[PDB]
């Protein structure tokens, strides 16, 4: 069994905060059940959360593995290897110039903004938000509400994906949670220990997720995704109650 | 006789060049009458143009003169003397952060772009945003048409002024062209010589520009204000054909 899950909302509040979810995390690793971080935040982000690797990054854009992963995959970026599975940041930016001429409105994104600016926007400090802006292949966007449809029909004319987490919009190629989640099960030292893939997620950039695993749960807000199942309270209380309730009976 | 004049569309084409009005200009100087820029522009903006004090800039939020213009008035600083009639540009970003929180949206401005943002913005060059970025009253700021308004409101709610200069809106407080050229006339070295002014604009912000002058003309795209004359033809053509018909033949 291998545990993936989404960090905010899911694994963690939306501020940073495990919660009644680090009990969650103790007993996992307790009865050694690998624990997947699967994300939208950049890789500074998840170091600065004290997480290790592996784990995925970037709504699926990158995969990271410990250097010395068992099997072979990737190339060398840190004290980690990493298999990039999305378009590098700057392409996403180029086309980005070319999705706003033709929306013809300002496409702004975290490129675009000063790390105070993105702090004051998302309630971090100036630190956490210089980590949001060290994007590898996802782009954060600001889009007003009135301009969405005209921005998101002019990200698929010139090739983009977008998807959201829930307040801003994302836009990549090639950066998909299940795909990412589907090629690190295939790169995995124990096949059976791989077999049993669960999923836990909050918003929409999990759907993705929750394809690619066997037990999908969401610990969101609204009505779970078509046959995924729900939890009494979101969160990391959320994550806790499928612990108990719907791992460990199966462990 | 003193000539006020608006830079971008006015003396100056779209394109930043002179064309027709270099000898308009050429001839005003041999007739020893002063020229006053009068614009939304930087002083580091109004610098890139080789302009001389005194000059207006950020729509009336400061006055700048040459350190030994014969009346004393202002602040020392370097060759110049300024004069601030508008809040400092700390102090209006503030208010927007109040804004931004009482509308419950992002309100976005230079401040909080990068110049390689500013640049691809306005179709400048990167050297050029920075330079439109060192802002010392007024803010220019990055609205889709949509959301203008539930902006603007905001705005007054928390005591900024705004104005648009024909595509951006800006918002500072104090800042007004007709003021800072009233105060330039009551700072005049020799009084008879700014007896007569001359106003030359052609949008939206140049309406206060017209109001403080004795002679408006104005040079934009459409019909004008009522009580202003008019030109066949806009922009630098319209400056040369001010200054010989309506200038010249007065002297
Ligand atoms: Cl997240
Ligand atoms: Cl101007
Ligand atoms: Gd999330
Ligand atoms: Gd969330
Ligand atoms: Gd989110
Ligand atoms: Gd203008
Ligand atoms: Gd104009
Ligand atoms: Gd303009």
């Given at each position: 069994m291998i545990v993936f899950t989404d960090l905010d909302?899911?694994?963690?509040?939306e501020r940073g905060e495990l919660g009644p979810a680090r009990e969650a995390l103790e007993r996992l690793r307790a009865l050694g059940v690998p624990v997947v971080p699967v994300t939208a935040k950049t890789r500074k982000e998840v170091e600065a959360l004290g997480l290790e690797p592996p784990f995925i990054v970037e709504n699926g854009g990158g995969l990271y593995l410990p250097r010395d992963w068992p099997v072979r995959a990737g190339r060398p970026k840190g004290g980690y290897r990493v298999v990039s599975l999305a378009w590098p940041y700057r392409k996403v930016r180029a086309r980005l110039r070319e999705a706003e001429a033709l929306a013809g409105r300002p496409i702004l994104g975290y490129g675009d903004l000063t790390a105070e600016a993105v702090a004051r926007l998302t309630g971090l400090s100036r630190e956490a938000a210089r980590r949001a802006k060290a994007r590898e292949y996802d782009e954060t966007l600001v889009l007003c509400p009135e301009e969405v449809e005209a921005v998101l029909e002019a990200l698929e004319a010139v090739g983009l994906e977008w998807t959201h987490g829930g307040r801003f919009y994302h836009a990549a190629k090639g950066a998909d949670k299940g795909r990412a989640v589907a090629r690190l099960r295939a790169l995995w030292p124990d096949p059976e220990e791989a077999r049993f893939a669960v999923g836990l997620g909050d918003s929409l950039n999990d759907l993705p997720l929750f394809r690619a695993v066997d037990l999908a749960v969401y610990v969101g807000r609204?009505?779970?995704?078509?046959?995924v199942l729900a939890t009494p309270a979101p969160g990391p209380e959320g994550f806790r109650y499928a612990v108990e309730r719907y791992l460990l009976p199966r462990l």
């Open positions: 909302g899911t694994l963690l509040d609204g009505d779970p995704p078509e046959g």
